[PDB]
Write a protein that binds this ligand. Structure first.
Ligand SMILES: Cc1[nH]c2ccccc2c(=O)c1O
Ligand SMILES: [K+]
Ligand SMILES: [K+]
Length: 274
């Protein structure tokens, strides 16, 4: 799966990215990582989609197999980076698929690219409501140079949700091991700022200039009150749908890749039929 890893200069930065360069009919599937991890989170999903689609995964500034400190940037800049990679690659039409807070990039990308280029989106496990106290606390911890690691640990607890989930544990404990405070502290500032300025992922989506089909596929939070704000949002908005995947962790791309794949294919086929 590292047979597909590339690197390129993007404005000021060398960014790594996955591209299987599959010669096939569009749309390209653009898999967008959350904060302080990289394309490795997608290694099982990429396998599900490899045969039939062109699959691109950009890594954000300072992210990759060798993380590095970089100057401060936000989702605005993640969006420009992603488009610049698509331009360099000649990719025209694409279906963006995001993980968690990679969603802020996805929804701004939909605005920027417009519905012709980006006609649909799939958002995975992304907190739809404004920060509850435990999560609000997590962010404040991430921002703290003394307590960022404690922040990440509390988040790992929430994400694993009491499961001995060997693939996810490996991703959190090994694949994110090289990320430091420069990343984690930034993710805290950006995510906090994102909800502050946009209200919520739902408010930001509802506010798109040109709304279009978006599906939220998620395994957590598992409580019925969270399902309820998804169903209420979907009752109000013909373009919004959701699917509870019932996977153990915050990482359906890792733990139920075959289920995440089928929703991606469904949206990719709807696009092919216009
Ligand atoms: C990979 C990743 N990174 C984060 C960093 C800060 C806050 C939330 C997250 C998150 O939800 C997620 O999935
Ligand atoms: K187990
Ligand atoms: K709906």
């Amino acid at each position: 799966t590292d047979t597909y890893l590339h690197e390129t200069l993007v404005f000021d930065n060398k960014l790594s990215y996955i591209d299987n360069q599959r010669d096939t009919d569009g749309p390209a599937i653009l898999l967008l990582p959350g904060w302080c991890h990289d394309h490795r989170v997608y290694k099982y999903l990429i396998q599900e989609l490899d045969a039939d689609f062109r699959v691109i995964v950009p890594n954000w500034r300072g992210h990759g197999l060798s993380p590095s400190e970089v100057p401060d940037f936000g989702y605005q800049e993640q969006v420009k980076d992603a488009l610049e990679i698509l331009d360099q690659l000649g990719v025209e039409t694409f279906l963006p698929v995001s993980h968690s807070h990679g969603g802020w990039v996805l929804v701004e990308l939909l605005e920027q690219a417009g519905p012709e280029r980006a006609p649909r989106g799939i958002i995975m496990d992304w907190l739809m409501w404004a920060p509850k106290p435990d999560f609000a606390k997590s962010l404040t911890l991430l921002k703290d140079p003394e307590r960022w690691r404690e922040g990440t640990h509390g988040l790992f607890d929430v994400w694993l949700d009491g499961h001995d989930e060997k693939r996810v544990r490996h991703h959190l404990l090994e694949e994110m091991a090289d990320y430091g405070y420069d990343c984690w502290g930034r993710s805290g500032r950006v995510i906090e700022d994102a909800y502050g300025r946009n209200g919520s992922p739902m408010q930001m989506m509802a506010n798109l200039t040109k709304t279009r089909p978006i599906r939220h596929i998620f395994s957590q939070p598992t409580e019925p009150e969270y399902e309820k704000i998804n169903s209420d949002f979907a009752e109000q908005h013909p373009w919004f749908s959701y699917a509870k995947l019932g996977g153990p962790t915050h990482f359906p791309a890792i733990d139920v890749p075959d289920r995440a794949a089928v929703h991606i294919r469904e949206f990719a086929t709807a696009i092919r039929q216009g």
